Amino acid sequence: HHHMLVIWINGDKGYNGLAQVGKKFEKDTGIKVTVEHPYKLEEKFPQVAGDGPDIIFWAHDRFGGYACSGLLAEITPDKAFQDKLYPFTWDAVRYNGKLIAYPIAVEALSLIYNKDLLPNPPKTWEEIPALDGELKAKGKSALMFNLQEPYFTWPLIAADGGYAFKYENGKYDIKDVGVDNAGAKAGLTFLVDLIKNKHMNADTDYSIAEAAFNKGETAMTINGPWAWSNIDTSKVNYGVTVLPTFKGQPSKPFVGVLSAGINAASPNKELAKEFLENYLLTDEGLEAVNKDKPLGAVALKSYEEELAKDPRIAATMENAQKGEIMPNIPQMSAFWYAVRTAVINAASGRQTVDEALKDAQTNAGAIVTPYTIKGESMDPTLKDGERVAVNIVGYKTGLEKGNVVVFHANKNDDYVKRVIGVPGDKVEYKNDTLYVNGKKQDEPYLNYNLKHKQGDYITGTFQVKDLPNANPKSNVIPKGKYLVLGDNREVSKDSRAFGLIDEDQIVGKVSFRFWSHPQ
Amino acid sequence: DHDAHA
Ligand SMILES: OC[C@H]1O[C@H](O[C@H]2[C@H](O)[C@@H](O)[C@@H](O)O[C@@H]2CO)[C@H](O)[C@@H](O)[C@@H]1O
């Protein structure tokens, strides 16, 4: 808890080097420093942040989501300190006007190649098929890299025109997503073609690709500076160079800035600040980490003037220049998840490229907001206190019968009920039997309440035409109106009492996990 | 925390 620091950093980074900086800090101050590298730490952090590390290391892209959620302290570096780091690194860690992390290092992917298998790396993605042909002849392959994380395939996807969210007039437009445009389709198609033609395997992941390259089995890989240490150990004669072009266009990697945030709930914020500013972000601190696993082009000017000398760093920055700084907006999480699914599905054959990217386009922009359920009127479908995810609906967008919707009841109160009828639907109840457009409709979500009722009927007979805001001449639901009922029908105050609601009151659809799925 | 009344 109190007289110590717990730090999270990813498994692929120099965590032993960071721990040595932690030992120096313990020597000087008596404050113990524990460095952990949990699997999927970037997803776990919100879970635990309630506990959780005092300091969390990740690429800057995740931090706006963390900050929006109130999980991060605003950092308070003075001018003198701010001047020690490149201005553009500070830009990566600013969110809603405030600094929310300490930038550490600029990361971009490069093409890494074995000079003994391949003295001249290919200028173009288009050469790789032939090249693989030649290399297969001697029991080798041309190219292996991690296909499970879209970070690694994004440079190819963006080459001919893909993008995440358009940045225009000083802000990102969350509605302008570049995932299923022509450029993205061509790139992902070429990737799938490589797999179809057995020049790559769809199951290749980080460790498989790294082992292959470091054991001399593949001529090329795609990875960041962190990977160079293991290659040094392997004695592969390697080079780090500019990524090939695709359709004449440079590959465009998403550039990250490894950043260090301070938990908003930490009682050691002052120690965290001391550690980061005066131990880590020094020539000596960065060197210790860098010596373990290279950081990339560091944020600290004094040390970067040394590392910029390295040709491999010159390559890293060259690839960066053709790419783009990741957005840090909260929507990034949804983007990456959408694009991970799309690549995996297109590569495995589960979907075509058009299908995968059409779904990804939709999912990357779909805004999701957490809500807490209050009351028992949706029981047992939703319970009092239940945390749910709510898919925000665009102003005049596709609501459907069965959807459970959050809506504004008044200026202060949001309600949640199930859509039983949409505009145009003719609806009534005869006892507990639902009739929509002349057909009885089963309501399996009421099965429990139907079989544990206090009364004769849980919903009871009624007709739309008798309800507030209805067409009193018709059971057909008016234009822009919706019939909503609570699943706990016996106790629910819903359209039976307050009538049809308006389309403009609806905020989103509640997402449900279905208990069953394929194995 | 956004709350929704069931
Ligand atoms: O693949 C999606 C993933 O991309 C980036 O994660 C990188 C990270 O920036 C690197 O430092 C390195 O650890 O590899 C990761 C990919 O496995 C984003 O930073 C991350 O948020 C995103 O989910």
Numbering used by the authors:
A (entry chain A): 9 to 57, 60 to 407, 409 to 530
B (entry chain C): 153 to 158
Manuscript excerpt for this entry:
They belong to a group of serine proteases that utilize a Ser–Lys catalytic dyad, which differs from the classical Ser–His–Asp triad found in most serine proteases and in the eukaryotic endoplasmic reticulum signal peptidase complex. Here, the crystal structure of SpsB, the type I signal peptidase from the Gram-positive pathogen Staphylococcus aureus, is reported, and a peptide-tethering strategy that exploits the use of carrier-driven crystallization is described.
As co-crystallization experiments with signal peptides consistently failed to show bound peptide, we modified the MBP fusion construct to allow covalent attachment of peptide substrates. In the Pep1 and Pep2 substrate complexes cleavage has occurred between P1 and P1′, releasing the mature protein sequence (residues P1′–P3′). The SpsB construct used here had previously been shown to be fully active, cleaving signal peptides to release a mature protein and cleaving peptides with C-terminal fluorescent tags to release the tag. This implies that the lack of density for the mature protein portion of the cleavable peptides Pep1 and Pep2 is owing to enzymatic cleavage and not to disorder of the peptide in the crystal structure. In the Pep1 and Pep2 substrate complexes, the P1 methyl group makes intimate contacts with the side chains of Ile32, Met37 and Val76 in the S1 pocket, with main-chain atoms from Lys33, Gly34, Ser36 and Met37 also at a van der Waals distance. The Ser36 hydroxyl points away from the cleaved peptide, which is the result of a clash with the C-terminus of the cleaved peptide.
